[PDB]
Write a protein that binds this ligand. Structure first.
Ligand code: NI
Length: 341
């Protein structure tokens, strides 16, 4: 059965609730983004209305074969009416097509569901600037002060310089990048761009990328692996065995692999600065874990919330243990007392 934090009170609406069967009283299902924990349950047999971004709608149609008649894509930053309720989708600064949803309830309550987000000061000049928000359903993934990581910009800088240096020293090195979902496409795109290569990948991943409306994409990606020196592979294959095996398949074109695993936060963020990051090496294979996050750091989340000043917060992540729930509630209270709302 559908949990309470996936329901929008006073509406016919749910958010990211497709794994529960038919939800009692649900007249429209919103989907914030195409990540599997959120889309779980959707397919070609789904016959209710789904509301989402254009990009998300492209993936529903082409990857899960949902029928066109039930996909309702909405423009960003635009007041829209859905079953008699005013809504707005806003960019979530998560993966491609990821939104936050503003709901304007009949009774005057205003609710913001962030879906999955990376809070940014640029959100303080969206349509959020104009009015008060009563409830905030918040992506609390890294809601604890030990969660620090660098900006996305600093991480790409590190990666571009690393890859550029290695291939310039050895023109027979291959660069490999791990993936398991949409998101983080800048990692592999920026590296291909500095090396003047296209990024090569399987047919299923190429398809997924063709749904994302990225400008001049046909110029960056390809399924011909032989013509590319930046390869994408599934994240699980980014280990010494998986990579040695892959190198075999390249038939003596390359004699070295430099690979990257984009993670979220790892505990080595507590001690090491981005400039100081070093790989794990075995033979002619090196692997860098790089902390490219698409979720708010603690400080980025705090800033957004203390700006917003919601009357009530409902977490959507880490909600399963009393210890986590308790911890999050203590931080909300601090933030509230510190800012004075
Ligand atoms: Ni996500």
């Amino acid at each position: 059965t559908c949990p309470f934090y996936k329901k929008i009170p006073g509406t016919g609406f749910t958010v990211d609730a497709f794994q529960y069967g038919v939800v009692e009283g649900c007249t429209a299902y919103f989907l914030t983004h195409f990540h599997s924990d959120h889309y779980a349950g959707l397919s070609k047999h789904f016959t209710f209305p789904v509301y989402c971004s254009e990009i998300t709608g492209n993936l529903l149609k082409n990857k899960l074969h949902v029928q066109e008649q039930y996909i309702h894509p909405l423009p960003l930053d635009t007041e829209c009416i859905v079953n008699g309720v005013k809504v707005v989708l806003l960019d979530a600064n998560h993966c491609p097509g990821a939104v936050m949803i503003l709901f304007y309830l009949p009774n005057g309550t205003v609710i913001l569901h962030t879906g999955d987000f990376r809070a940014d000061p640029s959100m303080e000049r969206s349509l959020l600037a104009d009015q008060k928000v009563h409830m905030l359903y918040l992506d609390t993934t890294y809601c604890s002060p030990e969660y620090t990581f660098p900006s996305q910009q600093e991480v790409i800088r590190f990666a571009i310089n690393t890859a550029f240096e290695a291939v310039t020293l050895n023109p027979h090195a291959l660069v490999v990048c791990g993936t398991y979902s949409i998101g983080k496409e800048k990692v592999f795109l920026a590296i291909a761009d500095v090396l003047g290569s296209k990024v090569g990948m399987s047919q299923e991943k190429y398809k997924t990328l063709q749904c994302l409306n990225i400008p001049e994409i046909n110029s960056l990606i390809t399924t011909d692996m032989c013509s590319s020196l930046v390869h994408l592979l599934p994240m699980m294959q980014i280990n010494f065995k998986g990579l040695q095996s892959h190198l075999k398949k390249c038939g003596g074109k390359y004699n070295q692999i430099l690979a990257f695993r984009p993670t979220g936060w790892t505990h080595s963020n507590k001690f090491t600065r981005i400039a100081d990051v070093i790989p794990q090496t075995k033979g002619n294979i090196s692997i860098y874990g790089i902390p490219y996050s698409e979720h708010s750091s603690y400080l980025e989340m705090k800033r957004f919330v203390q700006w917003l000043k919601p009357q009530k917060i409902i977490p959507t992540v880490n909600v399963g243990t009393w210890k986590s729930r308790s911890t999050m509630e203590k931080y909300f209270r601090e933030w509230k007392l510190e800012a004075g709302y």
